[PDB]
Design a protein around this ligand. Structure first.
Ligand SMILES: CCCCCCCCCCCCCCCCCC(=O)OC[C@H](COP(=O)([O-])OCC(O)COP(=O)([O-])OC[C@@H](COC(=O)CCCCCCCCCCCCCCCCC)OC(=O)CCCCCCCCCCCCCCCCC)OC(=O)CCCCCCCCCCCCCCCCC
Ligand SMILES: CCCCCCCCCCCCCCCCCC(=O)O[C@@H](COC(=O)CCCCCCCCCCCCCCC)COP(=O)(O)OCC[N+](C)(C)C
Ligand SMILES: CCCCCCCCCCCCCCCCCC(=O)O[C@@H](COC(=O)CCCCCCCCCCCCCCC)COP(=O)(O)OC[C@H](O)CO
Ligand SMILES: CCCCCCCCCCCCCCCCCCCC(=O)O[C@H](COC(=O)CCCCCCCCCCCCCC)COP(=O)(O)OCCN
Ligand SMILES: CCCCCCCCCCCCCCCCCCCC(=O)O[C@H](COC(=O)CCCCCCCCCCCCCC)COP(=O)(O)OCCN
Ligand SMILES: CCCCCCCCCCCCCCCCCCCC(=O)O[C@H](COC(=O)CCCCCCCCCCCCCC)COP(=O)(O)OCCN
Ligand SMILES: CCCCCCCCCCCCCCCCCC(=O)OC[C@H](COP(=O)(O)O)OC(=O)CCCCCCCCCCCCCCCCC
Ligand SMILES: CCCCCCCCCCCCCCCCCC(=O)OC[C@H](COP(=O)(O)O)OC(=O)CCCCCCCCCCCCCCCCC
Ligand SMILES: CCCCCCCCCCCCCCCCCC(=O)OC[C@H](COP(=O)(O)O)OC(=O)CCCCCCCCCCCCCCCCC
Ligand SMILES: COC1=C(OC)C(=O)C(C/C=C(\C)CC/C=C(\C)CC/C=C(\C)CC/C=C(\C)CCC=C(C)C)=C(C)C1=O
Lengths: 104, 157, 54, 59, 116, 105, 134, 84, 64, 71, 286, 194, 65
């Protein structure tokens, strides 16, 4: 069987601001499907779309700003996913990779 | 999972041991061991706070009252027919039939159950106790009031 | 004596920790066997009712 | 006697009980009267996160 | 499987006794406070409060005089029965305000701009 | 035929059933004192409390925890009153009974 | 404890996970969060140390047999023990309140609870039961 | 100070006597009832918040930082006289 | 006095050195300086998922 | 309160992604289990591979990765 | 790694207990214008070690009229509970850590009562009940103080707990009277001045006696660390030394209470004060 | 909204005021408490709903209180009445258990308290036996409630476990052959509690 | 309440007797229900997701290699 996974929890917390600003429609479709249908078979396409949209975003960040994202995610890993202990790394990463596409 | 299953099975041994011995002091020591071991058993199920309540109430408070009563009221009479009269064979037969062979179990027709650990949330317990079961909370307070007044009225003068 | 009582308690605890899981295993095996008999009887009844029920 | 004489004799003969009742009454009164007068007073996930970022970015 | 992210700061809005009704009268206020309950109370409620207080005073004076303690017994018994009556009256007023009892008198008095 | 979780669950239920009948019968069977009878009543309460907590975890339900707290409260109140009565009876009857707290002799 | 099902292992297949879990190091940030397992090991180790403290003077110390060396050189406690039992139960009841972000009706229910407590306590105070003259 | 209080009485007959009768107000060695607000605050700052324990603690802390009277026997000796 | 200073200094030094050594040992065990934080059910779920996915990444690495 | 509100928002963002990942993994595990059952019970008369027990509502597994004993 | 961490914790606990009992002697001497132990090692720095080794080669007295098992078990239980409480301070991440330590310290009553039951002395039975009554009476004020403390302890995710790593790192200025009550409650639990009237170890010699005193001083250090965590903004070496110096300073300058006097103090002063402060803090916390 | 629960708040407030009034009356050395009994009867009337059975119980307890004289006995009878009233409204085994246990504790304490003369130890003996026999029946009720709760997943009182709950109810009525606790109680305890 | 019930007669007679446990749980906790998705929507969504994968605006099923 194929191996399906999303990034680690500190990476998910580090990228969680871009998920709603860049993959909002997949998030909406997944939420609506899970509200309507309980069987996991009935929500397979939207689940697959959300997983692939998260992994594509994870591939984008590592191509553009890998070191800032790595140090921010390492900071979140070190301090137990407490955002208040890594404000400087968060600012540096959001400066390197903006949450929404600026100057567009 | 040998030690966990052994710790579960130890509670029944200590339950028999409370009544088996002739020394009242040793009966209380067996009960204290049983309540500590059961508090560790309850924490296999995921309960952190309620296991601590078990420890704090039963071992911390009630067993001290038991030991004071025993130490104030028990001149040694273990020879004085506590050993010389033995026990009841009918009661032992009833215990064997009902608790070893278990002809009337609590699961009834079922014989196998999957044990599942929980995740205790004390926010859920606080919400339940102070919103959904508030009348039961107040009636528990009234029972404690009965205990306090009744003890102070029944204290031997 | 104290050493005799400690040895007797240790013996009772170890014997209880080895002997009772065999009682529980035998009880669970009996329940599995009776459940499989019930499943086979239910399948037999279903086949009979399909045979004379159309 | 009035409020003053009885209060002074009570607090002189038993201060801890009187002070305990005063602390309890201050708490009860603050929650009953003082708090509800001065201190008492569907957006998506994206607007909530935008507001959180806006509160973070100035400081 | 994956549980809901818990909201620690939001408590459920729940009273321990649930009425299991829908109101059959117009709703003026679905949740009146104590000021709202007292300021829309009828005169019969105040009358039964004063009657309970008077009966309590007289009976407390009778029973407290056997141990020569009649005046504080009368005062305590009056307050005891009077607060029972006051809780009854406030509950009746709040139920009329919420729509579970008849409130034709209350709809023509509690809505100054929504009178007619 | 069965898994490790099923062994764990069946072992828990067998243990609590034997605990309940041990607390119900054993101290009476061994002809013990009223103090030990109250201790065995506490064993009965502990067995029921463990069963309720197991079921509360098993169903993901709150009612077992409420029952657990209530059982602890009622059991301690009854035990305290019983021990006070035991002390009062012992001081009332020790001049002619010696073995006054043993009614199973 | 080790996980006994594929669902308990987040649907990770293979034999490396089973051996890796059975031979894992204890980690509060791995599989053993909030675990209370160091409390048992501490009991075992401290019982070993205190037993070594008990046994050792039976070897390396002098000893002399004497019949005189092996010889001896109220109801208020009932009040204290039973009152402590009831008050400990009440504090255990109050603890789930303090661990929640309570709303106002929770606060007033808790204060009714405390009021019943302190009313019984104040009755026993006024009848002179906390004056330990006897 | 050497003043007395109703309540600080060490026995029971005097404790029973001070809470049921005002005979202690005639005795001149007792501390009088406070008469206004500031006197009540002074009495409460005496009973609560201690301040009588603290004076002894300040004296013993001053003694902690003071000189010592110990001689190092047998390198140092005491003082005797020819009549010894 | 001056005689009481060495024992009071030694208590502080003992606790400083012992806490430093215990910190280094537990940091080697846990590899993150927040192992002692409170964790709720969501955080426990996140750590257990991370552990199992790390084991899966190790299993898939020894196949290429 | 501000810190808790931020963490709750991030958890609400991450929760559908994690539930989707759980769902896809669960489906793959079910596919493997059905292949194994089809290999075991091929010669049994009348056996059907993949028979759901309930009729309307989906049944989650009793055990899960996040609930473990403490001791 | 857990066994290694526990042993590396156990080493400074025992070293610190030896240095505490020396420092108590020497600070008590300096307040009384003398020196205290100086001869036994340079600056007296070997005196607790020679006390321990002297008790090691001391004859163990086992009275042949008592129950030997409970007699042996009482100081072992005291020592084990002290070590377990220290492990709960430093090698735990539990949600209700303060409740865990309160539960452990409520178990410490058993060593006193087993010593009272085991030894066949007339006044050991008389004094054990008094000591247990004192500890039992002040445990309730400790619990209500913990209730007042826990109303303001929240972690980053918003959950209320008693986890020590989530406590704030600034002194709690709002709870100064509760801090003073907590310190006097610590003095009452350890049977120190002014509550030292009840002793229970009158029949113990050699290393059973040594186990009793190691347990007593380790429990004092546990309560000092707990008070520094709750009120002083953290656990540190300087705070442990300062609070120990304060306890010895109070022992130097005060006389002790009678039994009924501290019973009336604990049941008419400290418990109503802690409960009233809990009600006020609950009103504030809404 | 809590406006449908004023009778419960009235119950609690009345108990809080009655304890304080009983304390103030005893600080005067009053050797009779007819004023306390009248306030207790008023409180009994004020907390009882408007059903036939509820008012039958209320009027019965008002008549019964004229044979009791101490403050503590009146308090125990009021707190036993709370269990007796609220058991009639119990729709689960939770409230059933709590109401029955409150009644048992009140009866045990009253049997201990009110005995006098040479019959004091006989009454205390019969109260102890009743408490021990009641504890195991309460354990049976809890055990089979836990069995029912595990089997059904809810609080419905259906199935085979209701047979043991029925046996619990038959014990509380003194039904033979579980009748001998009442036979023991009748021989020693005074006439007012009988 | 969670363990007590009170029964009163409707004065007008316009109330229907139901199970009070079911009514209490409907008001307190609610009741969640779901439906099976129509299969045609499932294959339509699967086709759309496959097209989004092929055209390149969707990523892979794993962050790893
Ligand atoms: C809160 C409280 C504080 C506790 C918490 C503190 C934390 C833990 C610290 C550790 C404690 C430090 C000191 C330990 C004491 C050392 C022993 C000693 O001095 O002698 C005891 C000594 C024995 O009594 P004695 O003075 O010789 O005789 C007087 C009696 O009249 C004589 O009475 P008797 O003759 O009637 O009794 C005889 C009995 C004597 O019992 C004992 O010896 C005591 C038992 C417990 C002591 C445990 C210590 C170590 C003993 C060995 C443990 C081995 C178990 C297995 C381990 C693996 C090894 C292979 O031996 C037996 O024959 C036992 C029979 C077994 C039951 C039979 C009924 C069922 C029959 C069905 C079929 C049979 C199969 O007294 C005590 O029992 C003192 C009690 C205090 C012990 C601590 C309480 C808590 C224990 C830990 C928590 C429980 C968790 C469960 C885990 C495992 C169980 C332990
Ligand atoms: C009950 C009788 C004693 C049972 C002792 C027992 O079960 O031993 C344990 C526990 O006992 C010990 O290890 C300690 C032995 C006590 C004696 C040591 C004296 C001090 C040196 C074995 O531990 P391990 O499996 O080696 O440790 C597991 C890994 N981890 C370190 C992470 C906990
Ligand atoms: C000497 C005695 C005199 C007594 C009479 C005078 C004292 C006044 C009476 C006390 C206050 C009035 C009675 C209760 C008012 C409830 C009405 C209400 O809605 O008020 C608040 C309701 O809150 C409460 O205070 C609820 C009280 C809860 C009481 C819980 C316990 C009930 C009793 C249980 C007993 C159990 C039974 C025992 C026997 C089995 C909130 O008002 P709101 O909704 O307008 O405000 C909204 C805001 O955001 C907060 O909600
Ligand atoms: C030969 C057969 C012997 C059978 C003995 C059965 C009873 C065992 C009693 C404890 C034995 C200690 C060593 C066993 C290992 C152990 O701790 O086992 C744990 C089971 O819990 C338990 O065993 C829980 C029992 C704990 C009782 C100790 C009470 C201490 C009292 C101190 C006060 C505490 C205050 C509250 C905090 C889980 O082991 P695992 O599988 O996780 O380990 C390996 C993975 N790392
Ligand atoms: C949480 C806060 C806890 C506070 C605890 C308060 C304890 C109150 C006990 C007072 C008993 C002493 C006493 O005799 O009080 C009498 C009345 O006090 C009272 O009636 C005071 C009741 C306070 C209720 C709270 C004084 O008056 P008396 O009846 O002795 O005077 C006429 C006879 N000489
Ligand atoms: C380092 C170790 C620190 C401790 C060193 C000193 C040890 C002293 C031990 C003896 C203390 C005596 C004591 O506590 O006396 C009580 C008064 O003090 C207390 O009750 C003191 C504890 C409470 C502090 C003050 C609390 C209230 C402050 C203001 C609160 C309201 C405003 C702010 C919200 C009761 O003696 P009594 O004579 O009063 O007894 C009234 C009946 N006789
Ligand atoms: C026995 C004695 C017991 C003592 C009990 C003490 C109770 C202390 C309560 C302190 C309340 C919190 C301190 C002030 C913070 C307010 C927060 C706020 O408004 O934030 C908005 C705002 C912050 O601006 P933002 O940036 O918009 O959040 O702050 C203020 O407006 C605060 C202005 C100062 C007001 C000081 C009021 C002082 C008196 C309070 C009541 C005192 C008497 C109570 C009892 C009377 C008798 C029953
Ligand atoms: C001091 C003696 C003990 C006091 C507490 C004993 C009773 C426990 C509290 C029960 C509270 C019932 C609801 C109170 C409520 O809603 O008040 C808010 C309410 C809000 O004020 P509003 O603006 O008038 O609605 O407060 C009050 O008006 C009542 C004041 C509180 C009095 C509590 C005790 C009542 C009997 C005396
Ligand atoms: C000769 C025998 C006389 C007994 C008198 C029987 C009166 C029955 C009145 C019932 C009634 O109208 O219900 C009022 C009422 C129900 O009607 P509601 O007022 O609409 O609730 O319930 C009661 O107050 C019942 C009174 C029961 C009295 C004890 C039972 C018999 C003794
Ligand atoms: C006024 O107050 C005081 C008392 O009255 C309450 C006293 O009774 C005592 C005397 C009693 C003492 C010192 C006993 C308690 C302390 C002990 C036994 C010390 C514990 C120390 C340990 C375990 C470490 C020492 C061991 C080592 C270094 C290992 C050695 C190994 C090798 C060389 C291989 C003192 C000092 C005191 O002030």
């Amino acid at each position: 069987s194929n191996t399906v996974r999303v990034p680690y929890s500190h990476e998910l917390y580090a990228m969680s601001r871009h998920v709603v600003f860049r993959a909002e429609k997949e998030h909406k479709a997944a939420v609506e499907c899970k509200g309507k249908h309980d069987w996991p078979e009935d929500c397979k396409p939207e689940s697959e779309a959300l997983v692939r949209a998260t992994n594509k975003l994870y591939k984008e960040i590592m191509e553009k700003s890998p070191e800032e994202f790595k140090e921010y995610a390492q900071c979140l890993d070190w301090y137990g996913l407490r955002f208040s202990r890594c404000r400087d790394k968060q600012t540096a990463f959001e400066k390197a990779f903006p949450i929404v596409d600026a100057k567009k | 999972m040998f030690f966990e299953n052994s710790a579960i099975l130890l509670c029944a041994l200590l339950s028999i041991a409370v009544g088996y011995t002739k020394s009242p002091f040793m009966s209380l020591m067996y009960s204290v061991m049983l309540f500590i071991n059961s508090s560790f058993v309850l924490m296999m199920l995921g309960f952190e706070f309620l296991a601590l309540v078990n420890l704090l109430v039963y071992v911390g408070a009630l067993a001290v009252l038991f030991l004071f009563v025993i130490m104030l009221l028990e001149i040694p009479a273990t020879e004085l027919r506590a050993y010389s009269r033995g026990w009841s064979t009918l009661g032992i037969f009833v215990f064997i039939i009902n608790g070893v062979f278990q002809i009337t179990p609590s699961m009834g027709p079922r014989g196998i159950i999957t044990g599942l650990p929980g995740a205790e949330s004390i926010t859920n317990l606080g919400h339940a106790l102070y919103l959904y079961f508030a009348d039961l909370l107040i009636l528990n307070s009234l029972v404690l009031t009965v205990a306090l007044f009744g003890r102070f009225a029944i204290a031997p003068v | 004596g104290l050493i005799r009582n400690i040895a007797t308690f240790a013996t009772a605890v170890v014997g209880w920790s080895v002997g009772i899981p065999f009682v529980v295993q035998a009880r669970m095996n009996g329940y599995v066997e009776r459940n499989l008999a019930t499943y086979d009887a239910a399948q037999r009844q279903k086949a009979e009712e399909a045979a004379i029920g159309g | 006697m009035s409020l003053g004489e009885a209060f002074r004799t009570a607090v002189y003969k038993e201060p801890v009980m009187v002070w305990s009742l005063m602390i309890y009454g201050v708490g009860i009164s603050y929650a009953a009267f003082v708090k509800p007068s001065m201190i008492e007073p569907p957006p998506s996930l994206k607007e909530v996160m935008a507001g959180i970022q806006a509160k973070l970015n100035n400081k | 499987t994956w549980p809901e992210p818990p909201n620690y700061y939001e408590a459920p809005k729940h009273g321990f006794k649930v009425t299991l009704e829908n109101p059959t009268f117009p709703i003026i206020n679905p949740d009146p406070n104590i000021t709202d309950a007292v300021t829309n109370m009828r005169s019969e409620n105040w009358g039964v409060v004063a009657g309970l207080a008077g009966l309590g005073y007289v009976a407390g004076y009778y029973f407290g005089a056997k141990v020569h303690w009649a005046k504080p017994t009368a005062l305590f018994t009056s307050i005891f029965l009077g607060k029972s009556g006051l809780l009854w009256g406030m509950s009746d007023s709040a139920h009329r305000l919420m729509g579970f009892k008849e409130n034709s008198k209350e709809v023509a008095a509690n809505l100054p701009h929504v009178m007619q | 035929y069965y898994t490790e979780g099923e062994i764990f669950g069946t072992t828990f239920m067998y243990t609590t059933n034997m605990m309940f009948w041990a607390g119900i019968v054993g101290a009476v069977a061994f002809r013990r004192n009223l103090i030990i009878l109250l201790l065995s009543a506490e064993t009965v309460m502990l067995a029921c409390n463990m069963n309720f907590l197991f079921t509360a975890a098993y169903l993901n339900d709150i009612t077992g925890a409420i029952m657990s707290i209530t059982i602890t409260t009622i059991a301690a109140c009854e035990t305290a009153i019983g021990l006070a009565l035991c002390v009062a009876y012992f001081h009332m009857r020790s001049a002619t009974d010696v073995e006054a707290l043993n009614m199973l002799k | 404890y080790n996980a006994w099902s594929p669902a308990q292992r987040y649907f990770v297949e293979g034999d490396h996970v089973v051996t890796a879990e059975a031979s894992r190091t204890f980690q509060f940030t791995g599989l053993d969060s909030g675990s209370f397992y160091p409390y048992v090991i501490a009991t075992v180790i401290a019982t070993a140390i205190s037993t070594v403290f008990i046994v050792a003077p039976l070897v390396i110390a002098p000893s002399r047999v004497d019949l005189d060396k092996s010889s001896a050189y109220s109801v208020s406690f009932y009040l204290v023990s039973i009152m402590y039992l009831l008050f400990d139960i009440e504090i255990a009841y109050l603890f789930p309140y303090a661990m929640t972000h309570a709303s106002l009706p929770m606060y007033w229910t808790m204060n009714l609870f405390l009021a019943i407590l302190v009313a019984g306590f104040a009755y026993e105070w006024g009848m002179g039961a906390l004056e330990w003259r006897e | 100070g050497t003043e007395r209080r109703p309540g600080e009485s060490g026995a029971w007959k005097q404790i029973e006597r001070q809470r049921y009768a005002s005979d202690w107000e005639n005795d001149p060695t007792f501390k009088r009832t406070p008469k206004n607000l500031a006197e009540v605050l002074d009495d409460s700052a005496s009973m609560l918040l201690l301040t009588d324990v603290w004076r002894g603690m300040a004296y013993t802390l001053g003694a902690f930082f003071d000189k010592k009277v110990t001689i190092m026997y047998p390198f140092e000796k005491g003082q005797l006289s020819p009549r010894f | 006095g001056w005689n009481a200073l060495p024992s009071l200094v030694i208590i502080t030094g003992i606790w400083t050195a012992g806490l430093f050594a215990l910190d280094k040992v537990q940091m080697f065990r846990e590899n993150k300086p927040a192992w002692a934080n409170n964790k709720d059910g969501w955080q426990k779920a996140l750590y257990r998922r991370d552990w199992y996915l790390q084991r899966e990444e190790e299993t898939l690495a020894m196949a290429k | 309160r501000f810190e808790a509100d931020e963490i709750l928002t991030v958890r609400k963002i991450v929760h559908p992604v994690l539930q989707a990942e759980w769902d896809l993994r669960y489906l793959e595990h079910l596919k493997r289990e059905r292949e194994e059952e089809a290999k075991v019970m091929k010669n049994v008369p009348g056996w059907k591979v993949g028979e759901s027990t309930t009729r309307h509502r989906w049944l989650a597994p009793l055990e899960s990765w996040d609930k473990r004993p403490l001791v | 790694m857990i066994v290694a961490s526990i042993l590396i914790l156990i080493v400074p606990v025992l070293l610190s207990v030896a240095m505490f009992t020396l420092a108590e002697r020497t600070v008590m001497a300096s307040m009384q214008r003398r020196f205290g132990p100086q001869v036994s090692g340079i600056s007296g720095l070997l005196q607790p070690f020679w006390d321990g080794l002297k008790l090691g080669v001391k004859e163990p007295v086992l009275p042949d009229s008592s129950s030997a098992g409970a007699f042996a078990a009482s100081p072992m239980i005291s020592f084990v509970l002290s070590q377990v409480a220290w492990v709960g301070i430093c090698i735990s991440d539990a949600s209700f850590q303060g409740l865990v330590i309160m539960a452990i310290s409520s178990l410490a009553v058993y060593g006193v009562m087993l010593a009272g039951w085991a030894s066949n002395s007339k006044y050991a039975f008389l004094g054990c009940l008094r000591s247990v009554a004192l500890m039992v009476s002040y445990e309730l004020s400790l619990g209500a103080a913990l209730l007042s403390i826990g109303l303001f302890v929240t972690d980053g995710t918003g959950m209320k707990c008693l986890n020590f790593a989530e406590m704030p790192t600034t002194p709690q200025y709002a709870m100064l009277p509760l801090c003073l009550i907590f310190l006097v409650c610590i003095l009452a639990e350890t049977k120190r001045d002014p509550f030292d009237l009840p002793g229970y170890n009158v029949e113990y010699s050699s290393l059973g006696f040594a186990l009793f005193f190691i347990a007593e001083y380790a429990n004092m250090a546990v309560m000092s660390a707990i008070a520094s965590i709750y009120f002083l903004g953290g656990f540190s070496a300087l705070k442990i030394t300062a609070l120990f110096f304060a306890f010895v300073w109070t022992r130097g300058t005060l006389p002790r209470y009678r039994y009924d006097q501290f019973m009336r103090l604990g049941w008419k002063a400290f418990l109503p004060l802690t409960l009233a402060f809990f009600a006020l803090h609950a009103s504030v916390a809404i | 909204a809590a406006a449908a629960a004023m009778i419960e708040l009235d119950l609690c407030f009345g108990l809080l005021l009655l304890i304080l009034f009983g304390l103030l009356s005893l600080r005067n050395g009053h050797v009779s408490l007819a004023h306390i009994r009248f306030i207790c009867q008023c409180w009994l009337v004020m907390i009882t709903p408007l059903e036939v059975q509820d008012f039958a119980l209320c009027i019965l307890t008002v008549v019964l209180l004229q044979s009791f004289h101490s403050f503590e006995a009146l308090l125990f009878l009021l707190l036993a009445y709370i269990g007796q009233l609220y058991m009639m409204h119990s729709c689960n085994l939770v409230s059933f258990y709590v109401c029955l246990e409150a009644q048992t504790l009140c009866v045990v304490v009253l049997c201990g308290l009110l005995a006098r003369g040479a019959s004091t130890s006989f009454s205390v003996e019969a109260a102890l036996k009743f408490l021990l026999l009641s504890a195991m029946v309460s354990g049976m009720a809890l055990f089979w409630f836990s069995a029912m709760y595990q089997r059904t997943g809810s609080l419905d009182m259906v199935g085979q476990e209701t047979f043991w709950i029925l046996l619990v109810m038959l014990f509380k009525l003194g039904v033979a052959p579980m009748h001998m606790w009442s036979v023991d109680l009748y021989g020693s305890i005074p006439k007012s509690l009988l | 309440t969670a363990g007590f019930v009170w029964r009163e007669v409707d004065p007008t007679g316009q109330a229907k007797n139901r199970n009070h446990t079911y009514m209490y749980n409907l008001k307190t906790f609610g009741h969640r229900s779901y439906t099976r998705r129509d299969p045609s929507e499932l294959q339509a969504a699967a086709t759309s997701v496959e097209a989004r994968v092929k055209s390149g605006e969707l990523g892979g099923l794993s962050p790893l290699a």
